[PDB]
């Protein structure tokens, strides 16, 4: 429940200010950044601050502090979900969102603040429908704005009828220093790119375990979705009954669903690294990278980020296949391999020096994160079975999909 949502910069001056209740004074914003200087430098940083009775809900963009202020017991997730939405809608309008995006385009942005929220109550936040009466270039509001279907306007027409799906895997991994997998879940996310005519109701079916269990095909290949979070447009009451992915999509690119599942099978690529940290002297990383995944599959453009010490110096790299760049700016090495097929196992032998004087303070142990990408490859084994195009006009669309497996949080805790 917002009263005054503000946008600050890295200095703390107001990029744009907008109140919704008047219950928070407009000059309260000048205490936030010193309290932000306070809480951070004592490590008491929270996304909510408090100068007396004014509560400072804020997120942080590249430059920006979307500070939403309130005083009462406001609904908190109501605030921040709107905060990332305003970032999103600005990202929908302004291809980069910085200080240039605000001060040059205050014509539209104040109008967005008038439109997205009244009183602290977000009422219209779908940017695609918002484009139709809030332009930076005014007519009546659309019926889709009035309509319960609030994501897809009628009369959308294309020459072709293309449904572009992107079943994207994101492998999380937590391997400790012991070499055991602590947490390796997979958060996959199907993101749709719809180019369709009119108002279609798309009905999707996958190799769901429960839907195959309801069918009686719970012995064949069936992915087990531990939880999915869907779009609004999915009629979840229809899905709650019988695993039915039925929806009217919006037009264009959108993530429909967000599935999450655990997987007790091996990581696609196992890393073995060593550290010969010689005191005052040097360090050595004889790191290998074996691919456990399928040999037909190839891990594209992998980027193995191994955290090196800060005052590490004189780099030497005995690779096998793939180049190293040493990034002292991140105090690390990126042993990059472009093409790395399954079954392959490439070593890299790193060698730095170390100053004969010690440093003053500790550094801590960041894990190793790599940046693999494997196309045409569902590690969880999810398969889209069909996509029912249902139009009252009636057409034969072109449904299309590609499979891409990337990392989620691919952290492997170092020595």
């Amino acid at each position: 429940s917002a009263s005054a949502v503000y946008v600050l910069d890295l200095k703390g001056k107001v990029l744009i200010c907008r109140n919704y209740r008047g219950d928070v004074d407009m000059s309260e914003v000048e205490h936030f950044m010193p309290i932000l200087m306070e809480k951070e430098e004592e490590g008491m940083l929270s996304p909510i601050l408090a100068h007396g009775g004014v509560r400072f809900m804020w997120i942080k963009h590249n430059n920006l502090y979307l500070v939403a202020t309130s005083k009462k017991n406001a609904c908190v997730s109501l605030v921040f979900s709107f905060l990332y939405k305003v970032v999103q809608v600005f990202s929908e309008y302004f291809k980069e969102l910085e200080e240039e995006s605000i001060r040059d385009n205050f014509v539209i942005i104040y109008e967005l603040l008038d439109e997205l929220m009244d009183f602290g109550y977000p009422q219209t936040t779908d940017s695609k429908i918002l484009q139709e009466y809030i332009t930076q270039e005014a007519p009546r509001p659309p019926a889709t704005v009035t309509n319960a279907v609030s994501w897809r306007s009628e009369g959308i027409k294309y020459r072709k009828n293309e449904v572009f799906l992107d079943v994207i895997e994101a492998v999380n991994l937590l391997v400790s220093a012991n070499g055991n997998v602590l947490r390796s879940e997979i958060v996959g996310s199907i993101k749709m790119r719809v180019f369709l005519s009119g108002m279609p109701e798309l009905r999707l079916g996958l190799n769901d375990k429960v839907l195959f269990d309801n069918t009686g095909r719970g012995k064949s290949k069936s992915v087990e979705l531990e939880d999915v979070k869907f779009h609004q447009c999915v009629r979840l009451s229809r899905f709650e009954n019988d695993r039915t992915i039925s929806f009217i999509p919006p037009d264009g690119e959108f993530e429909l669903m967000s599935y999450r599942l655990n997987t007790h099978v091996k990581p696609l690529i196992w890393i073995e690294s060593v550290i010969e940290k010689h005191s005052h002297s040097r360090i050595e990383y004889m790191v290998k990278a074996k691919s456990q995944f399928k040999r037909r599959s190839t891990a594209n453009n992998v980027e193995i980020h191994i955290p090196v010490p800060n005052d590490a110096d004189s780099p030497k790299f005995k690779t096998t296949v793939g180049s190293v760049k040493w990034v002292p700016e991140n105090s690390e090495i990126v042993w990059s391999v472009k093409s790395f097929p399954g079954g392959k196992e490439y070593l890299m032998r790193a060698h730095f020096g170390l100053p004969s004087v010690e440093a003053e303070d500790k550094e801590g142990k960041p894990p190793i994160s790599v940046k693999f990408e494997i196309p045409y490859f569902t590690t969880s084994g999810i398969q889209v079975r069909y996509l029912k195009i249902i139009e009252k006009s009636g057409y034969q669309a072109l449904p299309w999909v590609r499979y891409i497996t990337q990392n989620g949080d691919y952290q492997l805790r170092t020595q």
């Binding site: 572009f164 799906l165 079916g205 196309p375 045409y376 889209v384 079975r385 069909y386 996509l387 029912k388 195009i389 034969q396 669309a397 072109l398 449904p399 299309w400 999909v401 590609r402 891409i404």
Partner: peptide, 13 residues
């Protein structure tokens, strides 16, 4: 998008 697409069925009756 340098990767290419693959067409699914429509009905799967």
């Amino acid at each position: 998008t340098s990767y290419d697409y693959c067409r699914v069925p429509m009905e799967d009756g």
